[PDB]
Design a protein around this nucleic acid. Sequence first.
DNA 1: CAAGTACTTACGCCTGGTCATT
RNA 2: AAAGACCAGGC
DNA 3: TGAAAGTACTTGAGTAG
Lengths: 209, 558, 538, 114, 96, 114, 82
Amino acid sequence: DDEEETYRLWKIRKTIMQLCHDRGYLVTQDELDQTLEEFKAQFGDKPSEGRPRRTDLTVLVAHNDDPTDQMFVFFPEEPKVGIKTIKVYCQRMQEENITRALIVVQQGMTPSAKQSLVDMAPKYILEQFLQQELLINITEHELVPEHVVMTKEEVTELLARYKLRENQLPRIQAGDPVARYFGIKRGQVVKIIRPSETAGRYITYRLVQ
Amino acid sequence: KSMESVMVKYDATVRNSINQVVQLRYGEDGLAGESVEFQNLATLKPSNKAFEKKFRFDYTNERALRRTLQEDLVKDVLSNAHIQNELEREFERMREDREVLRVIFPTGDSKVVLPCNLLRMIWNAQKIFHINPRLPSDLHPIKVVEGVKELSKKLVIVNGDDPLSRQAQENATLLFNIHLRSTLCSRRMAEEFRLSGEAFDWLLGEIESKFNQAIAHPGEMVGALAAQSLGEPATQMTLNTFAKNVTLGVPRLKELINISKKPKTPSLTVFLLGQSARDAERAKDILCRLEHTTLRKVTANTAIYYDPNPQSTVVAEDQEWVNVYYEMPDFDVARISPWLLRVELDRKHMTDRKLTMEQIAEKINAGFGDDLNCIFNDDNAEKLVLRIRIMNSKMDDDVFLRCIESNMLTDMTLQGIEQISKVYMHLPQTDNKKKIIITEDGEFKALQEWILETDGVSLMRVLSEKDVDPVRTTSNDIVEIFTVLGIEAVRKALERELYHVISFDGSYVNYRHLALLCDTMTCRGHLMAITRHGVNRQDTGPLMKCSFEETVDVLMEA
Amino acid sequence: QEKMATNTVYVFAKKDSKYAYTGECRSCLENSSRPTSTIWVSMLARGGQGAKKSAIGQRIVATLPYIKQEVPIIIVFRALGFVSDRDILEHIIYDFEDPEMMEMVKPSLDEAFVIQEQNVALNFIGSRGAKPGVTKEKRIKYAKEVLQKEMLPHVGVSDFCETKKAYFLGYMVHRLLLAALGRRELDDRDHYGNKRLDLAGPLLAFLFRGMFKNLLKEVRIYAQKFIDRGKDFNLELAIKTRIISDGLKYSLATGNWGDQKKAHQARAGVSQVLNRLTFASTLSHLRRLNSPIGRDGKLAKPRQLHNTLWGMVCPAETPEGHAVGLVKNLALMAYISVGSQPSPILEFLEEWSMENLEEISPAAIADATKIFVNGCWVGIHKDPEQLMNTLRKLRRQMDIIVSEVSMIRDIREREIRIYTDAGRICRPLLIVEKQKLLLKKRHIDQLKEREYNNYSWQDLVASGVVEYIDTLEEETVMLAMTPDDLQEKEVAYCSTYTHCEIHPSMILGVCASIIPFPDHNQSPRNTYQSAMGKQAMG
Amino acid sequence: VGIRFCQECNNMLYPKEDKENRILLYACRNCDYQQEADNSCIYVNKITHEVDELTQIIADVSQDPTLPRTEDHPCQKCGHKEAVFFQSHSARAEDAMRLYYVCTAPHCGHRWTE
Amino acid sequence: NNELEPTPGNTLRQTFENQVNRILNDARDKTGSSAQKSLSEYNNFKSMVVSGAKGSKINISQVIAVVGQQNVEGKRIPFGFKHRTLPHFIKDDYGP
Amino acid sequence: EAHKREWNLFYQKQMQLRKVPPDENCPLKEASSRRIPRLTVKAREHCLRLLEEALSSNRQSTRTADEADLRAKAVELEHETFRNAKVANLYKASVLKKVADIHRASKDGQPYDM
Amino acid sequence: QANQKRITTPYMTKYERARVLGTRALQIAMCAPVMVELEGETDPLLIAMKELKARKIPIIIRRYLPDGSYEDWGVDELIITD
DNA sequence: CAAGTACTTACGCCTGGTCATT
RNA sequence: AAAGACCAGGC
DNA sequence: TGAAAGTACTTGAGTAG
Ligand SMILES: [Zn+2]
Ligand SMILES: [Zn+2]
């Protein structure tokens, strides 16, 4: 029906707020814990021909360390995202000189849209997320351990202590769901803290290739 | 041949032939498996009141203190507040460590593998130094505290003053340190074991010596050992696994090793969150939201009739409600198509799935647009009938309706998640699948909840479903866990599946061997099958690949 | 050497093939010529061909010999001169009053709606052959030759036999449709009634046919190269005796069954060396059966002990290792049929009522039983019970039917199969009439005086007391294990016993009969002893 | 439900609509034969296949030695005590274990399920 | 007589097979328990079972009480012949 | 997945080739709406008249108040049925279910409460 | 690496003990001087074990850390497991 | 970018005899 | 005598 | 009669003035 779509939109917003928080962006506690009833009351309820048109759901966040870069999570209405919508999104980003962005597709993006999304890679990093992938926080799963994005100083210390070339570390594909969750590019190292029935804790580090 | 060259280097890091780090410490703790033994945590299980009563070291009693300690030690403990603060600090540390155990060990399984046997060594200390439990001891509790701290500093797996190495050390012996603090507690050493000073020092010495002997020996070819230790149980396991049917034994080991994309029984265990966990009806309702029920699972029989005019009603028992529908301003005035598809739906399947004819009409209209007529009985009748015409007003309507009916009965997706053949529903008897919680009194308790085992695997859709627990709904196909969750998730899942296939017969393989196999797969960033595609795909040498199933091909490529 | 029983229709179901149900028939012309020229009739799964299949799985197709791809069955039927779809259906469906089978066969007709003449159908078959003919005439001639000679040669290879071939092809399609509707069980794979054993007879015949073909080929070559000159020709010089002598010698010696030049493609492991360590070993080697399936197969089913091995193959004796269940040993009473030409049975059936397939209206075949002799469909019969009683009487008295000929009445399927084929495995069972043995005291009295009385086993069999029962007649036989406990009236379990076993200790073979009290052991220990006895010393 | 054949070429009749008369006509495609139809049902898809097995059973199975027989259940037509009983022996038997009885004695052939 | 409701998750035939296997396995277990409880303290079978040197409780149960259900492919002895396991039985005999 | 799009294209290609304000006093809430496609205002009037004769029967069987407030009651019922249905056939089915429920309530003898 | 900053196990591994015993035994069999006094033992393995216990083996084990650097540990410095 | 095909691999060790080709 | 194939067998 | 699964390859294929 349509309350299913509102439940989906609320859960997507919850997961995206957790995703923005985990990357270190400034999100309020209420944004992280907002009930479905509260979301309907604030955003009108019924999405079809209603107050939430899947626009105005976009969330702008700023990083704790420097409030200049920010990050704008979009919400396209077209089930098949095309060149035009990502183009207008990039224009809006530029007018506010914001750098990183997400695009929460409904079903998928056209191949030309994907090529254009990877085209402006150093200028404006825009990532793509299917709506289905955002209905659960994969990091909240019991099998998924705690991933922490290591800084360059920490990675330098890591390779100094163990005397490792960066390619001797275990790897993790950039398209892995957790790596995509933290938006890790090639080169960064992710610290993985997991419990063990033989040691208690084993901190691994995986390099993104 | 997958892990033949994997060994423990002299920096106590497990590395393959290309100096790639597989495990930072061998078996995540750095100790060889010959010396470890089963022990009980003794702090994970007991309740808050029991934990306090067993470890607190109540120094205020002044009566049991003299019954447990020598005369002078009681006066020292009562008078000196520094000793009291040290004792309270010890207990608070035990409480923190107990919470760490609870998060590390949910399900409350205190049976752990640790290097040196604390209980046996305390018994030996009692017997060697002729401890008389009936008489008070002569050991300062602060001596126990300081001694366990000194031993903690002296038991080192990852050395160096570096904060990184310091944290690695604290992790590598955390389980053993909680075990030592719990077993060597001041209260337990003054009340239960009642050791003496010399016996306590000897106990510290032997703990240190046995722990040092346990540390992995650099040069130990861990990979070959792990491969053989997973192959030896594979010989004795039955090739057959035989109402859920999950493949076990050599076939399941083969599916796990070869990361097969088409397992015989791709299953998905689903845990329900809210009231659906404790209620049969809501559990069945969620199951109806998961299993795939096309129109064939609900249709009794479908037949195409010739109905030149709707008023004719060529089916005799279908007049009344029809003339209720066509006495309205409908499109009958135009050339309504004559051919009719009459589908009778079975009542039993309708009431088993809580479906109604209204919802089937909605599905038909959604999947075929408003340009296809679908008027139904509106139930409350002895026969569930839906009469569908193709109103448009050459592909004559008979053949087109045959194709439409075949499509509806095959792929109409009336309800549920596709590629999910059958979803069961049962209350578990074994404790692993129950809902383990921590009571208010701090005690581990198991609550029986409804769970659903599903044949077919669609992990993302089930996890996204409302009233399905995302933190516990897992699957058993390695590839789908890798695709949905990640590479670490697939590591842990593969460990669990290997553990299942090995331990289904009660057999035990030490965790480090499974850990090394699961790491040698999920280390290069992708699920690397233990097969010619993955042992011969890595960045090893041509001569190592040339010994495993390709020979001339690898040499020609090189 | 085992082989699937030729001249029979077996409806199987592949696990994941593009065919759902496949009826195969291995056809040999009374072992007179050719090894076997099989025919398949499959049903093309459930997935359609775009715009024709929109039901539960249809479009019967036929895989003929020497045709590169499949041919729809209706085209094959029309190629035999049956243009009308009513005639084709009459050959396929025996009673049109059953709409389900018609609904099952209709899309196969819809596939072949385009082709509507005999010549165009034959062209359709021919153009898909090994090499399409340049002209229509060559394609037609090749298609006719494939249809008559190689496709189903056991039913007939002499010209006008097209009607008989049509009836048998319809029978295969009817078995296929029965399996598709579910009215028939899919034929058991390892069912031993579906297996024939080639003893030294058929095997040496198989080699001798090849070597004689070679001797004739060489003599024709010699004569042809000597006749261009036109002087004369001598047979003694032209005949190379080495062909027969050395071919037989090599095949028996090396074990590779066939020509020397084709050793790799030849069957191996036949004609082993008689191991003479122990007498029991010699006997076990002389009485041994070898399933030709590769020993490296991981499928457990072809190695398991089938229920049908009861009294034919020792349940215990089988070599351990990767050849377990595939090398078997005969039970004590097992006898392998040597062969008998089925001329008298056909003559008797024709004289004693029976209506041949040529002179019967197809509508009369629904309610009549179908008499098969050596697998070829010889006709239909109206009163089947009388026929079975009369045939059994003849076989018991051994006048027209020899004792090794099997007669089966599939009652639920209105079929009667008579087998005179060599290779069937049978055991002698005592005959039970009413609820008492025909083995009276007089027979034992004459056998106790076996000397100076000229009473032997053959007199016992010719007196209608004992009867050979092969594996697929054992299905229609209710057997009493022992008389003294089962024939007698009690709380009744079965009051219709048709045969009784002489002694249930004859299920065990030669090497397993030395076991004392074998019923008390665990069966694997009996297998280990069966292996060990051949290695004993004496 | 079944197949209706043409009267001239005996090839299959496919369903058709008579536009001028508005009536179901089974029309032939090998020829021009057209026939008025009375069933008004081109196709029937009994997916539940609630087929009674009594029509398939043949009375000659009564004279099968291997089948079991009871004197407890007499025949409803002739009252003969002995009756040979057997299970479905066919499809849909994986969820059906009902027994079918065929009466004995020649010429009765009655069959029923209990 | 069709008085057995199909257990959820299984068809009627599988439910009946489960009932038969349960009854026969319960019988084997109880008979084996009785045989074990009837062993003299001097029994050599019991001495080797308690010693664990070579043996199992089921071995005593089979050598004294009952050998038990024989399974092929995990189900009971399949109907190799036409609806009968051996010629000596009547068709559709599902008895033990 | 290929079969889905193939059948969709087939159905679209085989079906494509096959292809007023309330007068004065219509008793409907937001009658000038088109949330349900191909639902003519005359169809709404006819469904309202079926509901109104149902309410008249309920009055004759349970003695409701009067027609003056039955007008507003019918307005509310039809508006609720409008908001609970999407396609025209669904609207007809929902009004049929509601009139069947009204008939059930009238036959029970109890007044048609909310 | 240099003599300082030895970051490895102070204990002598079983492989190190095995190979040091084997090499010292071969040296002794090849008329090498024996560092410890011998109580009339003629088995080179037995003399080697006597020397190892007495901590008088003239062998330095070069342990190659995976980065390529090496640590040289004298046999006398390491603590024997047995 | 799917549908089609072909290729490679399928326990370890051990004992004897036989035969054809050299 | 040699390595190639096959066969049977032992654990 | 009664081998079979992962990874290749190997083809044809595929919105405005
Ligand atoms: Zn015609
Ligand atoms: Zn009767």
